[PDB]
Symmetry: C3
Subunit: 333 residues, 3 copies
């Protein structure tokens, strides 16, 4: 009783921003890529299932010369066990448990999910996490779920990609279309992170909440969160980098799914940093979004996504102000 | 109605050239590699199909240490739609539309296709191309086909791998075994390309024509083409590189397929550069080929390919003069 | 009649060593990874089969930034033919024929097989080998097998990963649970290897013998071997490296497979270098092992592996002394 899904996608994708667009939200140029992965589950007995998943990103916008590997990476690599109503346990490279909140609004055709950074403690995909998850409170309370996650230190060659040990968890409740969730995690920072000119403190923290409605072809969701010493930042001006002492982040999204296959989306996103050494208050992300995806079927879709960027040209970190539209065609299986 | 072919091959491959063979056509040593890819198509309705393909090259001739990734790359990554008799449109990393001509002679057991450079405008695989193709002139003229291709600028870290925007197209006609084709493309060069000591001008151009006969187990084909500011070149002597101001290229191939599985090949290829700054006229490629492939079945083959190199030892760019034989065994699926 | 097995695994894996553990046997931290590969065979006629295999290692313990490719590599890439009772021939990246002996004890849950180095002549996976193998002496003697292997020179950018040409072979005999094997190989060293401060001579050699019993849920095996100018070594102290002039290596392993799925293991391993320039005699590896693997089924397992390291703290090369325990969960297909 083993079942393995070999999956992936090819995505033709182009970003249009004015001129450079090194002063834009998303950049400009070919951004085509493919994904390949497997996910497997084995029925060990009537109450115990084992499972694993690996998922890799192949950029399609590099040449076949020296830059051939730019942006290629494993995204997910983990294995685990799931026992009857007791819960699941898995270990490896997986989603941070704060993403259990941030997923509510990470639903745009192309962009969105701006605060769910990779290799950033609990908010995105990260290496070396053991995660326990529970559905329906041990089978006792329909729609109530929770999880805890143990993050092992990863002392890497860059501050941006490092973390020390930490714990985080999430609780959510869903009932006939509605969902609420909260998530929090904290972890030590490493000395390389502490040595960064931007950001000061011994503990990174991240929390976020989410509300959503997800029924009758409607999707509305909001997330609000804060972080300390956790959101990574650069100042293009002095070329210094590190982490924002604080941030407050909101994301809203509303979307509708027509039966004939079109899926319009509108969204708002803002993330402001505070106490940034040498600057004070500064916006990191601030934009409105309109876009749509058109689904021909489960295997083929196309989409446009337009980012109406509200960052101004005088932003103190050198964050880009110009808009970006992305256009994509997706074959997947 | 989705169908995905997961495909690939393992290729044991060895090159024999005298001594180095840093002064040979193909080099010397282990050249083993594997390929993996998927190609999928989904029947969206009776007149519309979606499709995507990704294809990657894994070298098998690197160690497991620091050089482990040398020559690994995505070859193809694109997705598209094909509507009844109207045509197909796809975007991503795909073959240049000049390759629609150059494919006629790119048929040798191992070598050949010398002017179909990767990441070289329209002649080989390249990133960021939108390609439209038409079969049988909208369903109206059996055997008449055409295509146009829009190439977006790719300003990369090397001149050799860059291009500016351009358009190219191809028309071909096939009738009971015979085929003729022409293809042309032009594109801007980027300032990094223009700053190269070799090659001067604002526009790269490439064109090529092909004739072939391909029936009754016979395969005969010829290509003739020219290029301006498009064929990449190095002078080993001064270690300078860039692009040939002009070239003229011919390739011939003749082959026969025996029913018992052997496929002999003989071929001729010459590409001469002109107006090369500091040199004048110089051969880039000039060789005769004899070789064969033996097909045990659709999944297994073996081959030998011998390149009788006509480049002389006094060639002004430092192009190698010695011969090369390659031997290969191929399992594929 | 083609059959391709697409295979792989996801492995959540963590190493615990004290402090660093840069002075430990195995290190400390997340060591999660995945594997993907295919192996195919095609029935060409009733007596001839073609086959190929490729196998790749994706580390799951890197970030998605610049270090994303650390430790990723192709492990195997080869294709071949197998004719009735005559034998098999294959070429590409494959196991060294000395591994035909060293496999007997390379059976630990996580560690073990310490002398079977990658890209090290005949003892592990290596590029550019043509290998012939024979089963049951041409169909004439049940249980008697042999092989010869031709290794082509690989002059790489590092001494550690290079080899010159060489030949090696192996003979083994198996009868109702017992197995004996011997293997030997020799090859030239390259000038880059010869220029290393550690190791002196023109020929590398490696041999090893093995005994085992493998029936009735018991597994007991021993290997003894020697090497000249072949085992790679570093002195952390002066930061110099190269190859051990001589080594003598023993490995023992005993294991039992319970029907309910547990598989305890105990093992011993020691490898001592001799005539190391500037040092004399020095241990490379010296440890006891206890560990176990628990198999839920063919697709899921878990394991612990504890290495009781006997290298002392005064070891002259700077080889780590501290213990290491590894814990892993494995989903595979
Ligand atoms: C890989 C990321 C650039 S995506 C995420 C976030 N940004 C977005 O999500 C955003 N839609 C975006 C901006 C620019 C180009 C493309 C997409 C950011 O910064 N994180 C990075 C990370 O995870 O390391
Ligand atoms: C990858 C390429 C070396 S192959 C192509 C052309 N050369 C040949 O095709 C030729 N048969 C050949 C010569 C040497 C070794 C192996 C094969 C050339 O130059 N292009 C390069 C490119 O596309 O970047
Ligand atoms: C890839 C290797 C580190 S594994 C092999 C041998 N060591 C072991 O096998 C050992 N169990 C081990 C030690 C440390 C970490 C993990 C495992 C060694 O050294 N060879 C290297 C090679 O092949 O290049």
């Amino acid at each position: 009783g083993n079942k393995v899904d070999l999956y992936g996608k090819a995505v033709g994708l182009h970003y249009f921003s004015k001129g450079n667009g090194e002063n834009s939200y998303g950049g400009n140029g070919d951004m085509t890529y493919a994904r390949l992965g497997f996910k497997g589950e084995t029925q060990i007995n009537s109450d115990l299932t084992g499972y694993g998943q690996w998922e890799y990103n192949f950029q399609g916008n590099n040449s076949e010369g020296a830059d051939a590997q730019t942006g290629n990476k494993t995204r997910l690599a983990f294995a685990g066990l799931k026992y009857a109503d007791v819960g699941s346990f898995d270990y490896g490279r997986n989603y941070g448990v704060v993403y259990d909140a941030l997923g509510y609004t990470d639903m745009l055709p192309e962009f969105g999910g701006d605060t769910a950074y990779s290799d950033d403690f609990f908010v995105g995909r990260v290496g070396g996490v053991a995660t326990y998850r529970n559905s329906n409170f041990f089978g006792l309370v329909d729609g109530l779920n929770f999880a805890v996650q143990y993050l092992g230190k990863n002392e890497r060659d860059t501050a941006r990609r490092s973390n020390g040990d930490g714990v985080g968890g999430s609780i959510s409740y869903e009932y006939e279309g509605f969902g609420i969730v909260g998530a929090y995690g904290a972890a030590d920072r490493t000395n390389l992170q502490e040595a960064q000119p931007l950001g000061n403190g011994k503990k990174a923290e991240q929390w976020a909440t989410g509300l959503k409605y997800d029924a009758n072809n409607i999707y509305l969701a909001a997330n609000y969160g804060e972080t300390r010493n956790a959101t990574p930042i650069t100042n293009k001006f002095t070329n210094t980098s590190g982490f924002a002492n604080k941030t407050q982040d909101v994301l809203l999204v509303a979307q509708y799914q027509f039966d004939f296959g079109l899926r319009p989306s509108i969204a708002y996103t803002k993330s402001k940093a505070k106490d940034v050494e040498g600057i004070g208050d500064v916006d990191l992300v601030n934009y409105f979004e309109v876009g749509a995806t058109y689904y021909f079927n489960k295997n083929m879709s196309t989409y446009v996504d337009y980012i109406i960027n509200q960052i101004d040209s005088d932003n103190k970190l050198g964050v880009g102000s110009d808009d970006t539209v992305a256009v994509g065609i997706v074959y997947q299986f």
